[PDB]
Amino acid sequence: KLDIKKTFSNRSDRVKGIDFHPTEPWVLTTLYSGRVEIWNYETQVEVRSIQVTETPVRAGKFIARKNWIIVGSDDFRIRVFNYNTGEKVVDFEAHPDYIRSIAVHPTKPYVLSGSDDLTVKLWNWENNWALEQTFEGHEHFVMCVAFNPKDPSTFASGCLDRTVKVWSLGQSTPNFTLTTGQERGVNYVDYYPLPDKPYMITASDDLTIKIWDYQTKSCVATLEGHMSNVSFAVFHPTLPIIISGSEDGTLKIWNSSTYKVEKTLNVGLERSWCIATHPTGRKNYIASGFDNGFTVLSLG
């Protein structure tokens, strides 16, 4: 039963990136101010924070495997910190332009970064963070990268050039390019995590959200309702719903079967920029980052 409860919200500078730890009640936020925070959302106490740089930090993920966080910023750099000690693990220039998005491979020591330099790059931490592959083909800022959880030898990039490209590790060209018809570009791409549907989802400045069948390349549905740029849209890992956030300042929960809006939330923190869902669906936790801070919600 959809019974949405606010677990924890705090105010901060604009949060551009967000992620859940899989075994600790922690959420990571990365801010436009160059700061990153790890909050325990149940005790409502800060566990660790770092002033990483002076530029926006747009991307941040836990690497629970290694007790790390990995972050990417407008100063062109990827940095990794141990969250137990605060020690900096590595610090390198990844792209000659903004880093928009970082994805972590679930079983292999690989990280993907998407950039305004028109590329996605693959880094290998068991090979001294060497650059192992550059994926070229996009024609505008690549805004989002995501592994297929059902087959992480492939991944998707969403780009302001109005396309999504799907790639295989070890190969130089996309397996396919999706021409979305979202003419103001693609800000976000996500996979449906379960094996019954070959679905992907995209969000755009053109105010639409689109669902795709990645086998036929067809648009299954178009979700309209937001009144300003849609920053993200994701499938929930366990609940039959879709969650989106917009510069109109709302989160929307859509029925994933009928594609109708079930609930619109204005959490009162201005524009919404980022989203995370708890990897195992614990308390059906979700978290979103906004102009004025973040909120962690229990959906049911």
Partner: peptide, 5 residues
């Protein structure tokens, strides 16, 4: 710069 914010 698109999407500066």
């Amino acid at each position: 710069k698109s999407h500066q914010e």
